[PDB]
Design a protein around this ligand. Structure first.
Ligand code: NAP
Ligand code: NAP
Ligand code: NAP
Ligand code: NAP
Ligand code: UEN
Ligand code: UEN
Ligand code: UEN
Ligand code: UEN
Lengths: 249, 250, 249, 251
């Protein structure tokens, strides 16, 4: 039988590209989404047209709260419900916006940025492990975590936390044969919305090709880490950044 | 006149050594605490006996919740209320206990305590500290073993990682306001009194420098340096004080 | 045309697996060796048996000296002369032995350890860049670089310098389309001079499976990095260590 | 009696600032130098004017070669010769210049100077320091806060500084049982070259979050002094950035 993967924030962009690739590799997929319901259903339709009964959606808010654990347990349950097994968890969903030190309340900023980037990945990881072949987890990290954007402190703390989870969980889950790794984009898939001037300025920063990563290039590193070619790899985070993190100010 | 400092978790152990040293250097101090009310009150008394009205206490749970932003703002407000200024913030308070990924606190409470105390409260205190504003600085108590974590301590470790991120992000963001932000990262310091000596010696044996743990005072020494005029160009730096422990392979 | 690769220290062990696996993937290979002449030549025979005119040998000492630049230049030249092109360089050759701070002279130890692990990599990189598709370099690093073996200061210095090179060369060669990455093993192929209690000691520290990596698992990561699935990856070092680097003392 | 320190490359700039501050704190100093003879002798002169028989100069090339081990042994021997003891070693001397991968110094010579001064000489001086030994023995290596965002075409320089990080770590671990601490100070930008144009200096200064200015020599020396002092007795294997936040800035 075919393996199954949960991908969070899989309706659009990088998450969708990862889902599409996992599916092309032979995986059945849970497409988790929060607000992008239409895109998610559309993607599941498209994947099931390709191989019937190989994709479902699963809606969940991944903001921190007292029910987040139940919500993460339900995401993993939903993969067992639809496919009888859960082989891969990809923690991709992420809030991202500035939170300067000097609309939203601070308690809400905390709950969204730390919840999505750190606490949900930990809770999904617990639920993944508890419900348990080549088992692994891939956390979408950030290659720029040690050269942070101005006024992104909560976002940065969450991606830092996610590094620590990758390491702690690689360590603790190894005795169960579950590998835990990360993929760290630099800049990838610019908002088609974003001004051409700013897009170009980001592109000019990148040593390798003066362009952003495609979503597919990020997906490719995910595919490697979950593959049989990465069986001895745990606790490793792979930058997919074209050298961006290496460039001095 | 004399500068002022807030030290969180300042009633006992490393926080207390930090407050005392800062006090000895001429600072007035806010001794924050949570449960150790007797220790905090006797510490303030000892210090005020030494110099009049140079120490006050401030109780607050730093678990993450909807009220944490107000509690943190009140901590900084207590410094201005007591002393008319707030020059230094030392984020030392920390919940520490295992949270296994696989098997009576609920996990959402463990999350709130471990990520609140170690990361979120630091961020909120930093916000209030900066908002309320010379040698201004913040020192965050980190952990030298953060990239070789203890088994079954994922939330604690996540909290300490997040705190490294905060140190960096805040150093960058507050640099234009002349606030430096640095870290001190102990390895093993002041082992629990309750821990058998024979258990303490298994930690001691791992330390290359002297086969022993750090004193509370040695940790405080790094804090005093970071807050001094000898460190005026230092920001975003995390100084390990671990006697080589983090260098030792398994 | 089939692409071509140079693997240093390729007669035995991990270099051999890398050569074999590159060859299996379609590459023509230069098998560099220092003292293992008989194994290099039988490896070449075996690969040419499989596909004719796809493997040659090149002997060189990679110790640091006044002639090291010309040696490295001639290694790269072997590949151009045999195969008309050089697409991949793998810097795998490495001296490794204790050099206590408190037999060989210390200057010899410096030359061997720093030469094999860093300066030869640097010169080979220069020669490779200068002679110039999917071009890349893969440096064999060490996952335990920040928790070094006692009394191994020069080896560790050399491996640190190799991280340095990986990073600097990634930045500098990105404009030419040359990627530069690293693979950092933990423990792999324990020596035979090693006792049973000693090997068991190492194996027991490895979280993922309580075992060393196979040479093939290390090679899997090299193949990935040189592949089209790593087109956006430069300056990245992938640990392949079963989580050994994460284990506190 | 007064402790003694060796400072490599101490005739001017950061090394002089370090030697000056150790001396003021009470140390006897070996001022090592390579080309700057006049500057070194003149510094020793001042320091001796301040306290008699507390400074000496010591000439050595720290380019890698087969005699470098003897040269490093002689540097340390010179401390014992003049002062009867050697408590502190500061590895400050450093060659710095580009070595582009793609294209009148030969590459041999580039490898020798950059890797010699930044790494191999520090290793050999550390060996000789430990070998020649209530004390406070330590080593401070001058590292580089930008070691993971290297300058274009500085590969040999960067390799050398990376190797120095490794030495700092390896030596801390190995020399701990002897009571010898080993730490690093990692400047960002400090003391801009003399002839650099106002335009270029401005561009560097504007990159620094804390104050938009390079570090003073004294600022770097402050961190060295901290690490050698009794306030750092449990500190080993640590590298303190003194960079005004520079290393945290993305491009
Ligand atoms: N793009 C880059 O340049 C870049 C750079 C560095 C790191 N990364 C990392 O790579 C991953 C993917 O990047 P991206 O640009 O594709 O991400 P994104 O578009 O910013 O976010 C992906 C998805 O996250 C989900 N999400 C946001 N808040 C959520 C909440 N409270 N609960 C549940 N789901 C939530 C959203 O789902 P709905 O749309 O369904 O609401 C969104 O579509 C992220 O982890 C990101 O941090 C990306
Ligand atoms: N000790 C070590 O070996 C070591 C190693 C690595 C890092 N560190 C770091 O150095 C710092 C000091 O270490 P330590 O061993 O002195 O710390 P600790 O004794 O474990 O805890 C410090 C104080 O934190 C306060 N605290 C705990 N939970 C709290 C909560 N929910 N709300 C508010 N305050 C709370 C407590 O106050 P009350 O007692 O008033 O309740 C406690 O006395 C910590 O940040 C620690 O993580 C220490
Ligand atoms: N094995 C591990 O657990 C481990 C762990 C960390 C890192 N690594 C790294 O992964 C790579 C492969 O490891 P390995 O154990 O397969 O390596 P290895 O057997 O120790 O050495 C590989 C080859 O290096 C060559 N070599 C040594 N000194 C040389 C010199 N002076 N000139 C030219 N060549 C020289 C030798 O070639 P000849 O046989 O032809 O003389 C040897 O076969 C190395 O870069 C190593 O540092 C390995
Ligand atoms: N300046 C900065 O912004 C900065 C930034 C990062 C790191 N650092 C580090 O901080 C330290 C001091 O920096 P700096 O700018 O003061 O250093 P520097 O002026 O570039 O060099 C200091 C001394 O090193 C000696 N030196 C050079 N080549 C030598 C050789 N072959 N043999 C022996 N000595 C040699 C020279 O001595 P003579 O003059 O006697 O010949 C020179 O005066 C260095 O280790 C440097 O890498 C500095
Ligand atoms: N979850 C998440 N999303 C990101 N970008 C998303 C782009 C679409 C709208 C939501 C934000 C980034 C970026 C990002 C990189 C370059 C850029 F020009 C803009 C944003 C860095 N980390 C990130 N994490
Ligand atoms: N907030 C906090 N507290 C810690 N230890 C405290 C010791 C007294 C009882 C509460 C725990 C550690 C330790 C710690 C190190 C060695 C040891 F044997 C036990 C605990 C590592 N980080 C820490 N953070
Ligand atoms: N070039 C090279 N060779 C290595 N091992 C080789 C083993 C065969 C004999 C030559 C040395 C190591 C090791 C190595 C790891 C675990 C172990 F138990 C023994 C040696 C770490 N880096 C290394 N680099
Ligand atoms: N030994 C050494 N020297 C350095 N600078 C010196 C400036 C005076 C003349 C020799 C070079 C640097 C610098 C340096 C920083 C900024 C700048 F604008 C120029 C050089 C970085 N590491 C270094 N190591």
């Amino acid at each position: 039988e075919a393996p199954a993967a949960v991908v969070t924030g899989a309706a659009k962009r990088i998450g969708r590209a990862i889902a599409v690739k996992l599916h092309q590799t032979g995986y059945r997929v849970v497409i988790h989404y929060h607000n992008s319901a239409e895109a998610a259903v559309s993607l599941a339709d498209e994947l099931n047209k390709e191989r019937s009964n190989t994709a479902v959606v699963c809606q969940a808010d991944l903001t921190n709260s007292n029910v987040l654990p139940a919500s993460c347990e339900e995401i993993i349950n939903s993969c067992f419900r639809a496919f009888g097994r859960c082989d891969v968890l990809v923690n991709n969903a992420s809030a991202f916006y500035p939170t300067p030190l000097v609309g939203k309340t601070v308690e809400t900023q905390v709950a969204e940025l730390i919840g999505t980037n750190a606490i949900a990945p930990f809770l999904l990881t617990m639920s993944f492990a508890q419900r348990q072949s080549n088992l692994s987890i891939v956390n979408l990290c950030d290659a720029m975590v040690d050269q942070p954007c101005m006024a992104f402190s909560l976002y940065n703390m969450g991606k830092h936390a996610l590094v620590g989870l990758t390491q702690s969980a690689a360590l603790e889950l190894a005795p169960y044969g579950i590998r835990v790794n990360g993929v760290a984009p630099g800049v990838s898939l610019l908002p088609v919305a974003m001004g051409e001037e700013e897009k170009d300025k980001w592109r000019r920063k990148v040593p390798l090709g003066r362009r952003e990563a495609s979503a597919e290039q990020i997906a490719d590193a995910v595919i490697f880490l979950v593959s049989g070619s990465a069986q001895y790899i745990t606790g490793s985070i792979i930058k997919v950044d074209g050298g961006l993190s290496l460039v001095h100010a």
